[PDB]
């Protein structure tokens, strides 16, 4: 009953803490740094073959193979260098909202409104892609699955939870609860030891894989969050919401640093990614195009307007040589 | 170029051909989104050939996939855009709910939310007004004005049912774009499926006229 009072006080205290360690105004710290300039990117490749809206894509760690899922009930593996289709995996549920590629490259995973993360084995005798597992246990919908290794995957779902599974067994080895809304995005740290999620409660959470408990909470958005990425250093992350704004949060200061918005932008961000140096923040929008931001200056540095519909997914390669954007017009584009 | 690089190209071309052939077979199936406040769910039993529940049946060489999303407890705004492009929306409303509770007003509110939706601008709605049998007895005993104060007509099926049908069809704010195919559900073996097939073929014909430029 009255216990709600203490929490309020505690909340104030927390604010004061992150209010006491705020004396920089990062934008004011970069007054003397040279700007990135102007970034013009060309559609190096166009990957065709999906017959419906594509909803997710993921790069292979080799920076050459990528997987994309679409509503045509297809998970296509593309060789980005030659535009060749390596595999075309037919799915049992065409309502696919996410797709992942194992760091080893042996497996791809996918899921959506079916509430299951199906895991498909690519490197098999028999020369076919068989589904190696179907991880059930979520009561919402899969919005993002991201591999840790060949035998460990971390999912997020519309039931306001995330999970960490074991493949050989198929059981949830950990469950991450604490969101008061659908969890819509996931991002694993470069050390794959702690990940971050962003939910529809307009908040992000920094979790711990081993312990299983939330470590930090991150507010500041005035609408739901759809995209989240980690900065390459693994000490900050970027989130993209429906309020037309991208924000950068630092895990050590427990406070946001930059807000990437413009008055002439009213749509919501669907996907977020960083560059190999973390110096360019790429954000896909509902206005049918993508925007490139100077992550340290907050000023836009370019645009990738080449999609005739909503850009839904977006990802940069590990070597940093290319960018891939997927959209609701059923085409993927490799920029550079 | 290389021997093995050209075998990869041939494999990719075969994959493309199979994708084309599988997309051709999917475009001849008629996807139907099954809605309805508080569930005529369980309307779905008509033909007797985990989030979404896809029910597959066949009628007159036409394949119907009816996707039910009753189990999805998440906010509709985050997964309703997935069904943008379905052939039609089957919206079942129980006539014998005007007296209960208000429930008819909830049905009307849901119909307004769905029909006037950014994603369903051109998606025709098949309005199934079921429970007409119980509606007869209800209006015989309890006047239909319980739910519609403005109602000023005889408490009889012939008039009350029509008044409710017009009160539902008036919620459409885009009558130039979409059409609502109203129907009073009656088991009659293959009577509801027949109406669904008729409305679906009309919608398909409209879409094919639009896709050919002939309209």
């Amino acid at each position, epitope marked *: 009953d009255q216990l709600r009072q203490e929490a309020e006080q505690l909340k104030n205290q927390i604010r004061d803490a992150r209010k006491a360690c705020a004396d920089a105004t990062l934008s004011q710290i970069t007054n003397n740094i040279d700007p990135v300039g102007r970034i013009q990117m060309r559609t190096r490749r166009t990957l065709r073959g999906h017959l419906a809206k594509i909803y997710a894509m993921h790069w292979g760690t080799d920076s*050459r*193979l990528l997987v994309s899922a679409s509503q045509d009930g297809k998970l296509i593996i593309w*060789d980005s260098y*030659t535009t*060749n289709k*390596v*595999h075309a995996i037919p799915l049992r549920s065409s309502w696919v909202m996410t797709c992942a590629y194992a760091p080893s490259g042996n497996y791809v995973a996918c899921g959506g409104l079916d509430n299951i993360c199906s895991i498909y084995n690519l*490197k098999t*005798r*028999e*020369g*076919n892609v068989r589904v190696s597992r179907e991880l059930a246990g979520h009561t919402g919908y899969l919005s993002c699955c991201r591999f840790l290794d060949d035998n460990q995957i971390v999912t997020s779902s519309g039931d306001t939870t995330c999970a960490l599974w074991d493949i050989e067994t198929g059981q949830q080895t950990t469950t991450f609860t604490g969101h008061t809304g659908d969890v819509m995005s996931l991002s694993l740290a470069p050390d794959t030891r702690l990940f971050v999620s962003g939910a529809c409660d307009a908040s992000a959470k920094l979790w711990d894989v081993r312990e299983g408990m939330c470590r930090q909470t991150f507010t500041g958005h005035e609408s739901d969050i759809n995209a989240i990425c980690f900065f390459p250093n693994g000490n900050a992350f970027a989130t993209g919401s429906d309020d037309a704004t991208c924000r950068l949060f630092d895990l050590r200061a427990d406070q946001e640093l930059m807000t990437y918005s413009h008055d002439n932008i009213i749509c919501g961000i669907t996907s977020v990614s960083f560059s190999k140096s973390g110096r360019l923040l790429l954000a896909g929008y509902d206005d049918f195009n993508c925007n490139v931001w100077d992550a340290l200056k907050a000023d836009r540095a370019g645009v990738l307007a080449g999609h005739d519909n909503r850009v839904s997914c977006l990802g940069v390669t590990d070597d940093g040589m290319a960018v891939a954007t997927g959209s609701w017009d059923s085409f993927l584009k490799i920029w550079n | *170029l*290389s*021997a*093995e*690089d050209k*075998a*990869a190209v*041939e*494999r990719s071309k*075969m994959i493309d051909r199979n994708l084309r052939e599988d997309g051709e077979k999917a475009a001849r199936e008629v996807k139907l989104l099954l809605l309805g406040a508080g569930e005529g769910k369980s309307i779905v039993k008509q033909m007797k050939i985990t989030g979404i529940v896809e029910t597959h049946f066949t009628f007159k060489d036409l394949h119907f996939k009816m996707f039910d999303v009753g189990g999805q407890r998440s906010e509709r705004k985050k997964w309703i855009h997935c069904f943008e492009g379905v052939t039609a929306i089957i919206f079942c409303v129980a006539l014998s709910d005007y007296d209960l509770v208000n429930r008819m007003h909830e049905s009307m509110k849901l119909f307004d939310s769905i029909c006037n939706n950014k994603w369903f601008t051109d998606t025709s709605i098949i309005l199934f007004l079921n429970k007409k049998d119980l509606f007869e007895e209800k209006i015989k005993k309890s006047p239909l004005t319980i739910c519609y104060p403005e109602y000023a007509g005889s408490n009889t099926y012939e008039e009350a049912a029509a008044y409710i049908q017009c009160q539902f069809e008036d919620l459409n704010k885009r009558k130039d774009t979409k059409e609502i195919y109203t129907h009073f559900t009656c088991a009659t073996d293959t009577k509801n499926v027949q109406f669904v097939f008729d409305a679906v073929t009309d919608v398909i014909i409209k879409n094919n006229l639009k896709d050919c430029g002939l309209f």
Partner: single-chain antibody
Amino acid sequence: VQLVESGGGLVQPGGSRKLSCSASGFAFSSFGMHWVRQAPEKGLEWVAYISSGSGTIYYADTVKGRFTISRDDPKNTLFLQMTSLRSEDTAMYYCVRSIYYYGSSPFDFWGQGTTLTVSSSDIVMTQATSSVPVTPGESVSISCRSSKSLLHSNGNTYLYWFLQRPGQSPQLLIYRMSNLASGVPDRFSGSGSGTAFTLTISRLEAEDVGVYYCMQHLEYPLTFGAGTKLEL
């Protein structure tokens, strides 16, 4: 997987004969198939190739016109029809798998083969050694040389290494001169460039004694080395 072969036998010169290959345990339709041949006491020679979907067929210059390679995908079968047979056609014929996509491993599985007997610009791969005495635990390096650089402009060096133990069928060890096949230990390795190719074995052991073969997949026809025997 299984690739059984039937039809072999004894025929008179100039006759005709059909060889059948039954596949079981893999997606036959998504696999390119080759017909390799091995004379009684000689090396391997690639005979024919039919792509997945049958949209591409290749023949050796020695069999063009009189050998036809067919493929019955629904029943998972491969056929070789031979007409106007000669004494040079007496050999054991092997059915071989091959899938081609980025990172695949062609020639990963061979059949047991059928024996046929009868009464009485191409790249050249030089495998000079024909015998090498060894003792278990010793490290040996088998050498191969080609008449033309196998390195393609795409960065791939299309060199393949096979091993054929006595009374057995060849078993892929290395594909593209560096990549190690699945089912072979880290003892085997390969390295080189542009017509200079070397295999390497560390901590040799029994069951490694056989004939190591070289092959190029840069372009058709596919050519083999003469085979480097390795005994004790």
